[PDB]
Structures are given as structure tokens and as C-alpha cells.
Ligand binder design. Sequence first.
Ligand SMILES: Nc1ncnc2c1ncn2[C@@H]1O[C@H](COP(=O)(O)OP(=O)(O)OP(O)(O)=S)[C@@H](O)[C@H]1O
Ligand SMILES: Nc1ncnc2c1ncn2[C@@H]1O[C@H](COP(=O)(O)OP(=O)(O)OP(O)(O)=S)[C@@H](O)[C@H]1O
Ligand SMILES: Nc1ncnc2c1ncn2[C@@H]1O[C@H](COP(=O)(O)OP(=O)(O)OP(O)(O)=S)[C@@H](O)[C@H]1O
Lengths: 672, 91, 94
Amino acid sequence: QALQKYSTDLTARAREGKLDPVIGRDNEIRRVVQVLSRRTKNNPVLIGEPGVGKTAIVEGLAQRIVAGDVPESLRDKTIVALDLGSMVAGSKYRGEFEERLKAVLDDIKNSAGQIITFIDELHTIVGAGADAGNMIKPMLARGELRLVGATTLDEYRKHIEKDAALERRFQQVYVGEPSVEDTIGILRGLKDRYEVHHGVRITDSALVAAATLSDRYITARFLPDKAIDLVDEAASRLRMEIDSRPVEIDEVERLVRRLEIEEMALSKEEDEASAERLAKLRSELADQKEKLAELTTRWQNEKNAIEIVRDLKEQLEALRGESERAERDGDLAKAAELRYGRIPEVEKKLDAALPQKEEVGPDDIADVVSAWTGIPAGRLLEGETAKLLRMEDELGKRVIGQKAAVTAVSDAVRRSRAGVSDPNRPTGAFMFLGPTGVGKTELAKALADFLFDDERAMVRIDMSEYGEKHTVARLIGAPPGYVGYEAGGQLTEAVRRRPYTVVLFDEIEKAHPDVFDVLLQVLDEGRLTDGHGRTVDFRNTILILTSNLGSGGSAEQVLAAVRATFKPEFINRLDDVLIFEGLNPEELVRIVDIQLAQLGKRLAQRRLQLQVSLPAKRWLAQRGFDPVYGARPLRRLVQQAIGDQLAKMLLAGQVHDGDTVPVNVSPDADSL
Amino acid sequence: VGAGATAMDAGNMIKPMLARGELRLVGATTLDEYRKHIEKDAALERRFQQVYVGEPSVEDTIGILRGLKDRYEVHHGVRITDSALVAAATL
Amino acid sequence: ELGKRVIGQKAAVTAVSDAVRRSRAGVSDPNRPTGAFMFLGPTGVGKTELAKALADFLFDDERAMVRIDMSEYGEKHTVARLIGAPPGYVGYEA
Ligand SMILES: Nc1ncnc2c1ncn2[C@@H]1O[C@H](COP(=O)(O)OP(=O)(O)OP(O)(O)=S)[C@@H](O)[C@H]1O
Ligand SMILES: Nc1ncnc2c1ncn2[C@@H]1O[C@H](COP(=O)(O)OP(=O)(O)OP(O)(O)=S)[C@@H](O)[C@H]1O
Ligand SMILES: Nc1ncnc2c1ncn2[C@@H]1O[C@H](COP(=O)(O)OP(=O)(O)OP(O)(O)=S)[C@@H](O)[C@H]1O
């Protein structure tokens, strides 16, 4: 009777149907049984990575015993769940724990096999000492107490295989992880258990996506655990949407309810600097209050348009009663008039009346796997499509020219959002090289802005420091048992948290030609492993490789120089190698505008503008010279001409805030 | 992880109750230790869902300050101008 | 059947196939790996695709082949990455 204090009853719990269904895994259950019912040393231990299903098999065996599908050698037997935790609770006196464990052991032995002790997490049995988990070695080798355990695959070799005197008494049962085709079946069986918990309904076209999708994105965790969670969270989110107002009607309202308070408290400031701040927040407040009511009206357009059709469905039901009564009265004329007329016509009408949010679908799964792990996998929800359609106009605001590159960098993004690219390869990995000062670094910074709205959220590594072959370990971590090892890589451990950034290998031709060979398998597979032995997936980034090879050759004095610097096995991995071209005098008059815009923006910190005249605005370009240093010298000329005397004046009085000074071309130089 | 040791016995007594969702256990830990202590014990990490929290920008820090610009203004017997908030959030 | 994923290179598909039946028939030597041979040739021919096709013919899941890339093991001290660490060092329980 000591077991009533230190153990619960798995089989009794399964009798009232308080466990979950168990599907598949016939070989494993049959092996567990046929090992559990032998003469001596009859005690299995399940094993395998955490998440694959190892307690579900014991629970399935319990349900199977309650059913009666096991042979006579096992029919009518109770499985007890031992608990080493609740036995060492109060045992401060020198024999309490030994006494308790002895009582439990003798009470199990006293039965005739009516009891099967099932320890979960049995790797905890090595402790309890202070001669503990050692008084069970006698009874184990004789098969008296049946033991059933479950420990993850890599604490076994850490807590048990140390004690081979013990792991001899145990029979191993390897539990391999399932595949998608059987995870589909497991989900199809489990659906109803969550359908009742969350008062919603779940589509099978969604149970398929919750497994096909969660196998190529969330690669850190194992099968089953990583496909049930999407379903559960999606159902919970849909229930939240059902109860209160839906999302995207909630975020806008919340943020407006804050902008209001902000502008209210900003209205009572006694300054002129805040006067332009109150005059900008007051515009976004209106811009957002517009969309709130627009989306609010769009909500009723669907809430009541479908709602009017509810009477017609009931009307369709009324038509079915009408056909019933037509056939009651012998009204053949109405029988078909309802069967082929009214009822089917109202049915086509009602099919047309269907607006679209009352059951999870193959898109809420994508929404959850996008909120988690950050990788965008959706359907281009009507706002992203318009923006993606004009990108070479959105990148053109920072880069000027280079349509050769902007028509290819922005190409591997569209055909990746449209669900067409290869599923296991980087979204794009191409190296573009050309003369200096053209913008080959500015493009990979203008692009990263277009996605995350932050030019610094990308992983940038400078490949001019890797001048020695031994400096590779900086980005791949150091092998175990060395100085810096519990720090991992630096390239690797930076992508394992946000697998969406755009990595940028800057100035690649300077690195010693073995960093190339390390890079060789990053392309074409998107995988590498740091010291700890963790594979990291690069199948979503955009690998970009700057360079300065050739340096002046037209096309065959550089394309014959990169061939003699890289190997074919490496050049073959990349996508098309882009060639940048120099700057014509025409396409510099716009860089002038961009530079002056940036300068004025930086001078907005003092409420200080400045006017510019087209003569000087084109004289700057006319002194944009020497198509051998690109568009860099213009950046020095601007601050030699304008900013120099502007700063010499700004600290000598005669210029203050709110002012404005126009530049005008003196016969040779610029005079304010 | 290492609640009470001596040979692992404690700190995983809640590992069974976590799975059935008995307790809810919201917690917050830094980022360069979740892979130094927990990730090493992937049997337990499996029961945790991660909610990555990125750093905000200046435009949102300005709002956070504009909302928090009362507790300090009270604790110290002074007043604070919004220009100070903007200049601080920039510098 | 290997001809469904790899094309040509019958000279290699034969010598790969004749290394599995020679172990099923209980004939090959019992003290040597069940077959250990090296591919080499020009790039982009299949020398990596054939290993994947073979590793799927036997398990029906391409991810079930232990795979290590020899492009990182550039120095002696990295050998300990595939053998563990000597007794009493930093990473020893791994
Ligand atoms: N064959 C299966 N049939 C039904 N549900 C399953 C099956 N395999 C796994 N599950 C579910 O997936 C989850 C896996 O839970 P467990 O198998 O208990 O985890 P585990 O395999 O014990 O790994 P550890 O070591 O205990 S963390 C649970 O929610 C199970 O209900
Ligand atoms: N085509 C261009 N479009 C826009 N800005 C440009 C262009 N060319 C140069 N610039 C400006 O000059 C700088 C860009 O130079 P970078 O691209 O960083 O140098 P680079 O192109 O990497 O050449 P190297 O080989 O690295 S010195 C920025 O300040 C840009 O504003
Ligand atoms: N003989 C082939 N049959 C089918 N596909 C092939 C063949 N050769 C190459 N491929 C394709 O090319 C890719 C595989 O290239 P591989 O030749 O396996 O690379 P590799 O063998 O490692 O050569 P290197 O020198 O290491 S780059 C896949 O996309 C295949 O579809």
C-alpha cells in the first residue's frame, strides 16, 4: 500500500480516457512488448532525440492493455508510475530513503506480476544517495520488477553508460523520428482533441500545411513537437480573433489611442522647436484615423453582407421543407421545381454569397511560422505585391545607374516571394565587381534597407582581415577542448537567431585562399557547422560578394582575371557574376542632388536650411572629374567648398537657427 | 538548471508538469546564455517557446521617453523639456 | 533504379551496386568497411549526387546520411572535432 503514496496509476488514468490517442508505431510497441514479456532481464528502455515520441508509446501500451490487444502473458495487468522525486522529500534521517525504497520494492515483488513499474526520466535514478539506485541491481537481473524507461539520447551516454555495471541490465529500443507522410496521419488523428478545447474547426488542407511547411523552416527541433505547436497556436489565435475585435483593427486602434495622448501632452510646450514636432505628429494622427474608419467600414461590409445571406440559407431550408411538402401533396410539378429550380438556384446564389474567418486554414499556419522564426512565408498580402512590383524605382533613390545589377538583385527576391525558387539553396548568392567608387558596397546597403528598414540589421564581415589561413576559426568557432570554445563561431552564431539577414562578404579578393574553400559549401547547400556540432541553415539569406578585381579591363581583361584567381569549382557555384560599369558625366548631376539632400537633412538638426542655384549645382558635377576614382572625390569637394566656409561662418555669428543661405557661383569658386 | 545537485536530480522535477501545461511559467532571460546553459540540455529546452525581442529605433524610444517623462520629473523636483528627450534619444 | 537520379557514369553505378550485393550474399570480408572508395573528376558531374542517391536507396530519407565537410578541417587541432576531447578538458561530456 506504500505505492499509493509514491506513485500514480497510468493504467487507471487511461481507463477513464484521460490520455491522448496514440497512432502508428506498431514495430516499436511490438518490440517493447516482446522484450517486456521474457524470462529474465525483461525491462526495456526507450531512447532517441527529445520530441520524437517516447512517452506516447508507453501511454499507447497502456491504452492497448486496457483494450485487451496484448497476449495472455500481459492481459489484465496494471502499469504503475514510479516517482523518485516524491520519495526523497523528507529523508534527512540516516535510513529513511532506504526504508521507503525497500518497502516499495518489496510491495512490487510481493505481487505476481500484476504491476509494471514505469519510470520516466530514469537517468535520474543514478542519484538519491547523499548506495542508492544500487539496491535495485539484485532485483533487476532476475526480472522480478518490470521496468520501463525513457531518456533522451544524449543524456544516456552521460549518466548511465558511465556505469556499465548497470546498463547491462537494460534493453535498448531506438525510436527514430517519423517523416512528413506519417506526421500527416498523426495530425489527422489528433485534430479532434484540439477542436473540442478551442471552440473552432480545423481544415485538413491546414493539417497538411502545418507539417509540409514546418519541416523546411524550423530546423532546430524534431518531428511531431514542431508540427503540433503550429496547429495549437493557430487555433488559439483564431479563438482570440473570434472573441474580441480582430487584429489589424486592434493594433491601429491601440496606437491611435497613444498618438492622441502624445499630441495632447505635446500641445502644452512653450517652445518653437516643439512647434514643428506637434505639426508632424498631427498629420500621422489623421493618416491613421483615416485607415481605422476605412478598415472599420470594410469590416461591416463583410460582417453584414454575408449576414443577409443567413436568411436565404434558412430560406434554402424553407425551400427544402417546401419540396418535402410538394412531395407530400403529390406535387410532382413542385418536386423538380424545387430539386432542379429553387433549392439549387438559391444554392448557387449562396455559393456566390460566400464572402471569404471561422476555422484555421493553410494561411494561419504560415502566419504563425512567420511570426516565429521571422522568415516571411505568406501570399503577398495585397500590400507587399505593389511594393515588390516597383523595386528598381525604390532602390533607384539611393543608387544611380547599375540597372545591370538592380535588375538581378531585385529579381531573386520576386521569384523567391512568389514561391518559385529552389527550396534548399540561398535565395541568391552572386558576386559583382568593377572599378572603385561605383557603388558596389552602396547597393548591398541600399538593399538591406529595403527589407528591414535598418541598414545595420545585416551581418557584415570584413574579409580583408583574413590574411592567414589560420584565421578561419574566427567565423567557425574553435574545436572543443581549446581556449575559446564556449563561444561558437561569429558568422555562424549570428545567423542562428535571425535566419533572414543579408550577409555581405566585403572585399573578398584580399582573404587568403582557404576562406574560399570554407565558403565553398555555404553556397549550393546553405549549411556549415561550428565547433559544437550545430548545422546552421543558410537557405534564406542573400550572400553578396564585393570585389575589385581587374580594375579597368573592359570585359575580357577582368573576366580572364577572375578565372585566374578563383577556381572553377568555386566560380561554378555562384549565380551570374555581375560587372559594374563606370560613371558617365550625365549620371553624376543626380548624385549631386542626392549629396546635397543628405547635407540638408543633416543640417535640419539646427532648423537650418540652405538654397542652391542650378549653376553651382551643375558646376559641382562639372568638377566631378577623373573617371578613375568614381563618385568619391565629389564627397570631398562638397565639404571643401560649401561646408568649409559654412562652418567657418556658423561659429562666427552672422548665421543662426531658422536661417537660410543660398550658394551662388562666383566666377571660379562658390561664395555664400 | 542547477537548483540542487550533489548526478542530476533536481531542476527537472518540473519537466513532467511542463508538458501537460499544468503551470504556465513565463520567463525572461538574456540571449547569450540561453545557448550557454539551457540549449545544452535540449530535453528541457523543447518545452519552451521563444519570443525574440528586437531593439527599438529612435522613433519608438522617443515615444517611450515621452510616456516615461513623468516619474523622473516627479521624483526629482524639476521639469523636463521635450527637446531634451529628442536630443537624448539621438545622442 | 539509381539511373532515376544519376545519368551516365555506369562505370561507377556498377561498382557501387556490386558493393552491396557482395555483402548481402554473405561473401565480402567481415573485417573491413562494407565499401570505401573515392570519386574524382571534373566539376558538376554527379560525384556528390550519386552519394545522395545511394544514401536514399537504403533508407528512403536523404537526411539520414552522416555528413561531414572536409573543407573546414584545415589544421591538426581541428581533428579533435570528430573524435572528441582528451580526458579532463573543456568539452568532454560531448
Ligand atoms: N505517435 C503519436 N501519436 C500521438 N501523439 C503523439 C505521437 N508522437 C508524439 N505525439 C505527441 O507529441 C508530443 C510528444 O510528447 P512526448 O513523446 O511525451 O515527448 P517525448 O518523446 O517524451 O520527449 P521527451 O524526452 O519526454 S522531452 C506530445 O504532445 C504527444 O502527444
Ligand atoms: N553609383 C552610385 N550611386 C550612388 N552613390 C554612389 C555611387 N557611386 C558612389 N556613390 C557614393 O560614394 C559612396 C559609395 O562608395 P562605395 O560603393 O562604398 O565604394 P565601393 O563601391 O565599395 O568601391 P570600393 O572598391 O569598395 S573602394 C557613397 O558615399 C555613395 O553616396
Ligand atoms: N549526373 C548528374 N545527374 C543528375 N543531376 C546532376 C548530375 N550532375 C550534376 N547534376 C545536378 O547538379 C547538382 C549536383 O552537382 P554535383 O556534380 O553533384 O556537384 P559536385 O558533384 O560536388 O561537383 P563539385 O566538383 O564538388 S562542385 C544538382 O543540382 C544536380 O541536379
